[PDB]
Design a protein around this ligand. Structure first.
Ligand SMILES: Nc1ncnc2c1ncn2[C@@H]1O[C@H](COP(=O)(O)OP(=O)(O)O)[C@@H](O)[C@H]1O
Ligand SMILES: [Mg+2]
Length: 278
């Protein structure tokens, strides 16, 4: 058969390109680098939808440079989505997201992400030396910098007990890192990238008490003077956050510090009373 109408001019290579899965986001022509100053974050009246329910509805907030904002709320509320949007994994249908006064949709995605450290629920380990796994944070970094990141992340000492030190093959085809060593690797990667903003999605598993306390101290280290948004599962994170947004069905139903949320007696307070069990 002879393809007719518009079909005679269709480009098959374009049809195969459109079949691909993560169909993603474009830099707008002429976009320059994010001019990052101190990492102030702003969501103004943000709306977003994956499908036919709005996932996020009129979501507004600010994170001042160096402050931590915790997202909490029921499953499916849209917490993780918020981090995704700041990374510009997706575009928003309305409203505006800014870093230091600049629409994140109008700078290069490359520069945007160069200033963001993502600490994910769980850690991709590559089939590579422990040193190259850390260097993943910033590929051009010196060995000295890898060791400094590892030192700050609390993993240097475990690594020195490995049979080939920093050269020890890890991942699937290498030495098994413990669950705690893997988390520390993600931390070391982030310390090495040295971003001005951290996006932290807390693991919903936990390790033993003393390890959990150690990892939590190492995380608080990486976040301490960086603007941070955390999807918070741990009560200690929320207690110590500079601000908490309580999200329910895509809407920020309440916000403030821990103590002010408790004294408000609303949904957060209900959560805290329930976990307390007095
Ligand atoms: N990739 C996706 N495609 C379609 N819907 C999604 C996708 N990811 C999450 N969702 C939906 O968006 C809503 C928000 O999910 P999410 O941001 O993960 O919430 P939380 O982090 O509060 O658990 C949920 O209803 C979820 O089912
Ligand atoms: Mg969830």
């Amino acid at each position: 058969l002879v393809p007719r109408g518009s079909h005679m001019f269709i480009d098959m290579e374009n049809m195969f390109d459109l079949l691909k899965e993560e169909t993603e986001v474009k830099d707008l022509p002429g976009a320059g680098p994010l001019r990052f100053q101190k990492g102030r974050i702003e969501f103004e009246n943000v709306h977003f939808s994956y499908a036919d329910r709005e996932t996020l509805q009129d979501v507004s907030f600010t994170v001042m440079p160096g402050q931590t904002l915790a997202l909490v709320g029921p499953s499916g509320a849209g917490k993780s989505t918020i981090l995704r949007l700041l990374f510009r994994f997706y575009d928003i249908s309305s409203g505006c997201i800014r870093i230091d006064g600049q629409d994140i949709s109008q700078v290069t995605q490359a520069s945007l992400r160069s200033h963001i450290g993502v600490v994910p629920q769980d850690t991709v380990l590559f089939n590579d030396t422990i040193a190259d796994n850390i260097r993943y944070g910033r590929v051009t970094a010196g060995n000295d910098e890898v060791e400094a990141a590892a030192q700050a992340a609390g993993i240097h000492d475990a690594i020195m007990a490995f049979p080939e030190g920093y050269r020890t093959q890890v991942g699937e085809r290498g030495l098994k890192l413990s669950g705690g060593e893997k988390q520390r690797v993600a931390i070391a990667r982030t310390i090495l990238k040295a971003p001005g903003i951290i996006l932290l999605d807390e693991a919903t598993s936990a390790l033993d008490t003393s390890n959990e306390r150690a990892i939590q101290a190492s995380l608080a280290k990486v976040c301490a003077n960086r603007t941070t948004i955390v999807v918070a599962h741990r009560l200690s994170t929320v207690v110590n956050a500079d601000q908490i947004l309580v999200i329910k069905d895509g809407c920020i139903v309440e916000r403030g510090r821990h103590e002010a949320l408790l004294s408000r007696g609303g949904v957060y307070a209900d959560m805290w009373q329930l976990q307390q069990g007095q």
